[PDB]
Design a protein around this nucleic acid. Structure first.
Ligand SMILES: [Mn+2]
Ligand SMILES: [Mn+2]
Ligand SMILES: [Mn+2]
Length: 192
DNA sequence: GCCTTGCCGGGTAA
DNA sequence: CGCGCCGGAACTTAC
DNA sequence: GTTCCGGCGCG
DNA sequence: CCGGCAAGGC
């Protein structure tokens, strides 16, 4: 479980990108702790994401179930679990200390969430500049050059652009790495 | 003249 | 009574 | 993506 | 996120 640290970082990438970590207060004084990943495709959630999360749940001995909730515009993968909530939230605080394998898992997960998925250009969008700057250093250390600029003035959304000059390096070494789960498209490219 | 990458508006998938 | 899992979905907006 | 709702479980 | 347009570089 060099392997659940990997699956974890991958899942954290999807969570940070397309989901969230929610601590809720209710009447009264009831509460709830949620780990959420949302996504349009129901089979992507059920076939590629949910089984990774389930593996993690079993390893951590989390007794919560994986819920799949249908919304009008997206499916929601949801785990209601205080333990899993803090497991991911602490990991998120220690993100700058990720070892190399975790960095790749995380970047891969973040790319599935927010990346340019035509792969004609290699781009990641986010309003969290500090998060993108952490990914920028990780990429540079991996020999993948990149820039960051404000790409949407209306919403404060930055873009991280990966130089097409390191396209093969990025796609083969980060996205297609077999040290942790392969994202779709990348796995499909390998099998053709 | 062929790429690469910043800029930007549309609107879906968060 | 005081909190923490379910199951749904109305609501806002960041990709 | 975010936070409401009603519900149940358990010490 | 997508995809078009254009300034900039080679
Ligand atoms: Mn996001
Ligand atoms: Mn997103
Ligand atoms: Mn996405």
């Amino acid at each position: 479980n060099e392997n659940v640290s990997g699956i974890s970082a991958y899942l954290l990438g999807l969570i940070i990108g397309d989901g969230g970590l929610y601590k809720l207060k209710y009447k009264g004084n009831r509460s709830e702790y949620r780990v959420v990943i949302t996504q349009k495709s129901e089979n992507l959630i059920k076939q590629h994401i949910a089984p990774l999360m389930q593996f993690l749940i079993d390893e951590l001995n989390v007794k919560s179930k994986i819920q799949i909730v249908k919304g009008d515009t997206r499916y929601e993968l949801r785990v209601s679990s205080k333990k899993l909530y803090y497991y991911f939230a602490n990991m998120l605080e220690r993100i700058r200390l990720f070892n190399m394998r975790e960095q790749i898992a995380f970047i891969k997960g973040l790319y599935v969430a927010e990346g340019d998925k035509t792969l004609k250009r290699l781009r990641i969008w986010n309003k969290n500049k500090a998060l993108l700057e952490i990914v920028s250093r990780w990429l540079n250390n991996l020999g993948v050059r990149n820039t960051i600029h404000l790409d949407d003035h209306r919403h404060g959304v930055y873009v991280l652009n990966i130089s097409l000059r390191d396209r093969i390096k990025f796609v083969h070494t980060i996205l297609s790495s077999h040290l942790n789960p392969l994202p779709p498209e990348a796995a499909a490219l390998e099998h053709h």
